[PDB]
Amino acid sequence: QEKRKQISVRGLAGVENVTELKKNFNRHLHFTLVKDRNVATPRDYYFALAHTVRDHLVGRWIRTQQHYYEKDPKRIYYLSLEFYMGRTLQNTMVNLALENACDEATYQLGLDMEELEEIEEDAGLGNGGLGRLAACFLDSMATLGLAAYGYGIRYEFGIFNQKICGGWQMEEADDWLRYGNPWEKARPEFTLPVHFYGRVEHTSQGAKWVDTQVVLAMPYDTPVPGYRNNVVNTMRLWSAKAPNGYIQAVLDRNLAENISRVLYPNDNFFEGKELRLKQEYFVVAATLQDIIRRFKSSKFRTNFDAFPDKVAIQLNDTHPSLAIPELMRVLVDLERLDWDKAWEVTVKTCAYTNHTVIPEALERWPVHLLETLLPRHLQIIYEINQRFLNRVAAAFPGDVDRLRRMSLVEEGAVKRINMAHLCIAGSHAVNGVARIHSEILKKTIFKDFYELEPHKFQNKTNGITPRRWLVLCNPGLAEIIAERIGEEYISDLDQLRKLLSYVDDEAFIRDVAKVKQENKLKFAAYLEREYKVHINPNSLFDVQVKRIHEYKRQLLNCLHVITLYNRIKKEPNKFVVPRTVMIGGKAAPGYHMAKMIIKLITAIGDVVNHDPVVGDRLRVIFLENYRVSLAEKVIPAADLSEQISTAGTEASGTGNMKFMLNGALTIGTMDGANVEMAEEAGEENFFIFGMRVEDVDRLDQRGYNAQEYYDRIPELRQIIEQLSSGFFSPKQPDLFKDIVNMLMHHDRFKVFADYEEYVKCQERVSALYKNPREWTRMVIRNIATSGKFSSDRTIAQYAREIWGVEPSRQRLP
Amino acid sequence: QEKRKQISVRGLAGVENVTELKKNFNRHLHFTLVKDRNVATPRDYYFALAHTVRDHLVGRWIRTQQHYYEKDPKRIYYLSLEFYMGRTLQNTMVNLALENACDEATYQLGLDMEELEEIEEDAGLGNGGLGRLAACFLDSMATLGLAAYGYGIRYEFGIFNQKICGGWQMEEADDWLRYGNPWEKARPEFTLPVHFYGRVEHTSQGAKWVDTQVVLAMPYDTPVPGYRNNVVNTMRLWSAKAPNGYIQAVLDRNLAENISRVLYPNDNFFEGKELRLKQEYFVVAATLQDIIRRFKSSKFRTNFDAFPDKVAIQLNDTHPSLAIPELMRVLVDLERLDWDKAWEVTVKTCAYTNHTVIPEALERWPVHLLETLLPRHLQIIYEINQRFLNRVAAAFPGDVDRLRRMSLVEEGAVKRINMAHLCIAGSHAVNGVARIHSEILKKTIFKDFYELEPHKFQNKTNGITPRRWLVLCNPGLAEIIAERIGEEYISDLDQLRKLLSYVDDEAFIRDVAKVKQENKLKFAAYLEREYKVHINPNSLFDVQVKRIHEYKRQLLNCLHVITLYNRIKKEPNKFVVPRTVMIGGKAAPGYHMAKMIIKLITAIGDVVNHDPVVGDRLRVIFLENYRVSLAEKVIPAADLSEQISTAGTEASGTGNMKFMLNGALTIGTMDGANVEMAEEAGEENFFIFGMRVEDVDRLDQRGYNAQEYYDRIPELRQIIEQLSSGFFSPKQPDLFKDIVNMLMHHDRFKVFADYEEYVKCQERVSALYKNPREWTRMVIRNIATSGKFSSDRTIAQYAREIWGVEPSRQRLP
Ligand SMILES: O=C1NC(=O)[C@@]2(N1)O[C@H](CO)[C@@H](O)[C@H](O)[C@H]2O
Ligand SMILES: O=C1NC(=O)[C@@]2(N1)O[C@H](CO)[C@@H](O)[C@H](O)[C@H]2O
């Protein structure tokens, strides 16, 4: 209670507030939960607290939304098929300044608030970085006072819960709604219809989309609180409902209700299932009906010319790209605008954000599927394509191959629509998510488009919210910073640059170190308690946590780990800096190599963790079920952050920024936002290694030959021979033959090309770690220059450079 | 507001209570609903009222349940696959004495409480009489202070909503949960597992049921308030949940969740679907786990001998009959009791109520299905059968045909288990639901069983609650009665016999008549408003409302209606008492003849209602979507109650009692509880006609020949010739050929045999109706002798004669 008390960033425990909070906790326990103190469990107490905390959002939510309707500012509609929100109780209390008051109120009731917070399920409606970016963006938009609306789908099952059984991943449905969600509000009264299939009738009123099947879209609205500004915006997620022999017809309502059943668990990989396309159109269609209704009730041919002055649609990836043709369908077929005026409006309303580089991560839907499911949309896409290729032909006359490359329609045995090209043609702005990625979009990936319309192309380096990713998850660090520079940095993170004044301050050096040690102790206690794994608290915590994907190269980290193990065995008496290497992350079901990688991590640990010569000098653990609530516990405890993707493959990364803000040093390639992070802190304060993008390209030009590296590096050959001969799988000697085959003959990500410099860089890490004072001084140089990586900076640049609206920190009454 | 005010039976509007109710309405509107007075609709105001009213049930619910756990009285478990509860807001306010206070509170807020009550959806978890009996029984059990628990299944879809399209029934899913159910409380924490399929392993610990598939049973608990006694019991309904490639496995969770999806819409007809058997075992299995847990936490080999002293299981029909073998399975396989002691306990715990006569309404499950789905239960049933047939053989030595007739196992191409015989063997009491039906169970249907164990056989004449079926639905009548004899009759209905003192009281005669006229005006306004049908308010309202079934003979009512029409056309100048004949009721989907009957009613109206000679002297309407909330509006408005089943087919009826309590006179056969109703009022005050059961049997003995009636009755022949030649279906002349064929050659219910006496009796009705004073005096003789038909009388006799517990009207603090 004592540290919680002491933490001034957690606010005040005013005596009347504490009294009111207690009263309301007991009121909810009785009237809402219908429980009594003799039978109540810790889960019942968590719900009573959550309902109490929620009541504090209500007046601000109704007043904020009423303010927008009165004032009529331009509205921002952020459309996304993922929102990885995490848990909400602590975030709500931080943003409303209720944390110490609730801590005191619950303490007076005989309860431990932190134990109650652990009952909450993450809302895990996203796969990883992109879903988590959308959640940091809704927080930043509310903190910056924008009239912003996140729109998505309410999946009944989010990303699966990962169990590890016999060292392998197993997927279990994440039934996050089992005990209810006290944060959302069902809005059945605002249910709207969404159409599928059918056919187009061309008459004298234009086209008519008829004979469709209807699925209803019921919205659930969740409040999104800004940081101490009394703004509460809304996330509206749509849930699928069947329209309004006999038994079997009732049971068959499940087919339409299956649209919102489960998140597709792919990360940087397009799976073209019809059910996903349905999910996409379902979000787009219901969402554009709200946009159009709100526009018509706003101010006021008069109306649609001003539509782009009052609406921005922000497409998160191409997942909601059908908003481009759906808006044209509504404006032309239903509102009766002429095509040209409708297209003018559509392009000024929409903007697209791209988050990938790999060709197989782009959405390319078969024309036959679009024809069957959304026949009027395919007509509209072909017309969009003919007018855009007419502009290409007039700008670059006679360049026939440019027409083929830029077309929305891709040739082949199955013709497809390239949804990225559709977004570029229909948006006034296109952006990537880190300077290197935005630049490669202009130079290579979409170079023809950039040449046609260079003003469309922008950069918006990603960021993370310093509320969840510093005040909530690492209050100790938040408090020692506040002790020196006040609290303003929480909503103005560039003020962390003031911490460079303390690089030679003995107390500050002391306290940064003390906070990291406390977080390592809290993490080790969580691991012993919840998963019964024991880790050495006096070891360097070396952490690689992110989805499992060949491009992120968890395998390169495996090679390093086995190198440390083999070096210890060769020279057992030689001192080495003790390490706890932790790797965690989910594999898409169906991505075989990623599943084998998880099994290799566990298998390495099975040998390494039981070798008496190694003892506690080296431990390798796989962290099960990596997810936002676990990132909040392990990132603050980390010493080394592994950001080792092959140069050119991580479009930005965001876990890299989380670690930098939480006092870890980074070992990484010049990839994604790592380049900007190293620029901000100074490259001498980062452990950059390996090929740069120019090097990777040179290797591709002459041909990547993994055998050359195997032949020239004895230590590498040793590990490959261990893997192949069954040293890490004695009961099934050929278990890892597929990983070896890939590494030796088909590695698109050049794991062996960075092995030598990776292992050398790791040694430099270890050498600095032996000097605690200078390790900590380099940490202070990182925390103090992490300010650019606030999502408030990123959202302020979307507002000013894309949406045309000015962000504000002015408090609402 | 004025009559509402004046109605003293509606309680007091205390000034502080009105103030508190208003405060709490606004609090719920803001914090619970997240609405504000500018956007709030009548639906939002209904929910704010419902949440306010619900808060008044909470303390009594927690205190009542705590009282049982402390005091440890014998607990009554009433198991039923149907609970036709209807709407709850008004019932809750009546039982808690909040009706005038809420009426005043809402009136001060500018709202009309009666309009808000109309927003509520009936909870229509039952088909008709049997489901509605279970709901009147839960009310009576709470009013009599019993520690009773109703246990059922929470169907997502209850009985379908009936639309009439082109004069035919159409079924629509009744999505009663769309806007939520504010009355229930989800209890996910108390979810339990239910097993299916698998196989039995016989070991040295006895049998072991292994390799099963699990479906979870999540309970939802709904409060059940007694009448002004502060008792609030619980209805617990179980909801199916799946246990704890990849996408398809998540979607396939729907298969297990389909167990609680929809009510089978059959009335007096067994459909042997596997999914229904699953529904049955799901209720039984989860329910017996609660019973056993509660017993073990109660008092205290010691334990199970006292099990029948602390538990009663009441089986509503054979639908939960699997409780007999499930209890033996739990006691023998899991608790390790020996078979004999377990059977002793099981028979003293269980009791069965039978509600049907027709052979096809009895449950007979294929042994192959039971073998596949519930292999240990089939083993147990065969053992139960062998020991029971050993008792039969020792009691009646050498009677081999008795063994075949009484066996639980029925022979044939498909062998089946007769669930009624299983209940009789495993229960200490068996009862029918009206004296004539209980007697036929002993004399014919289960005569061998009665001869073996005569002490098991009982009678429990059905009843209805006078709360919903008099105070709620007909406050005007409730008030004129209270004016004379106080309010005690509401929970002691035999006090209505005091009203026989007023058969010659001019004011009372005047006011009974005035109340009926007001109800007819309210009903006619509802019909004009909601369905846009116009009825003549100065006509005799002749009402037949009940499920559509050949045995209930809506067709006999059709023949009468056409007879009136044909008699008018023959002698147009002759005065006749104007009538509005209304028939309503649902047909099971799939029951062809019942669907054709609905179409014949509409078709008759299509001719009759547009004939200028008839004008407003005769109108015939089909009332769409007959359901508990509609019965509460039309029964109080009725003048004549049609209860015309063939003698011997309606086991009791309950709509007959509703009409008697609400001031209608009855035209009926000596069938079911009609016989007891006529006994109570005096046969001179009832319009009894037709064959008695002895007559029906004599006709069966010589052979029913419908042609004889056609040949001897000119007026009947005329109608049959109209039907056959297309007079009621000119565009499709042969439309009713199937109804004619059945009537003429395959009528199991002898419609033509009662035609002549039915039409004569109807004329006697009409003659009395021409003398308003003497019609009303005969109504007073009916209302005043309706007291035996209170469900409190019926439940007091179950408590004393079957459950061994004493009912009480003592108030809880
Ligand atoms: O498909 C993707 N999943 C991601 O996490 C991703 N693209 O988007 C993120 C948010 O822009 C990026 O930071 C990450 O580099 C990229 O892989
Ligand atoms: O299967 C049935 N449905 C009914 O309504 C029924 N049996 O049960 C009721 C309740 O006991 C009876 O009143 C009714 O006569 C009988 O048909």
From Swiss-Prot, chains A, B:
Q: Give all N6-(pyridoxal phosphate)lysine modified positions.
A: 658
Q: How is its activity regulated?
A: Allosterically regulated through the non-covalent binding of metabolites, being activated by AMP and inhibited by ATP, ADP, and glucose-6-phosphate. The activity is also controlled by post-translational modifications including phosphorylation.
Q: What is this protein called?
A: Glycogen phosphorylase, muscle form
Q: Which GO terms describe its cellular component?
A: skeletal muscle myofibril
Signal peptide residues on this chain, from the entry's feature table: none
Q: Which domain of life is it from?
A: Eukaryota
Organism, by scientific name, is Oryctolagus cuniculus (Rabbit)
Subunit notes for this chain? Homodimer. Homotetramer; to form the enzymatically active phosphorylase A.
Q: Does the keyword Metal-binding apply?
A: no
GO MF annotation, one: nucleotide binding
Kindly list the residues the record flags as site (Can be labeled by an AMP analog): 149
List residues, modification Phosphoserine.
Answer: 8, 407, 491, 724-725
> According to its UniProt record, which cofactors does this protein need?
pyridoxal 5'-phosphate
Q: Which residues bind AMP?
A: 36, 69, 293-300
Q: Name one GO biological process term.
A: glycogen catabolic process
Its keywords, alphabetically, are: Acetylation, Allosteric enzyme, Carbohydrate metabolism, Glycogen metabolism, Glycosyltransferase, Nucleotide-binding, Phosphoprotein, Pyridoxal phosphate, Transferase
PANTHER family of this UniProt entry?
Answer: GLYCOGEN PHOSPHORYLASE (PTHR11468), GLYCOGEN PHOSPHORYLASE, MUSCLE FORM (PTHR11468:SF32)
- Give EC number(s), comma-separated: 2.4.1.1
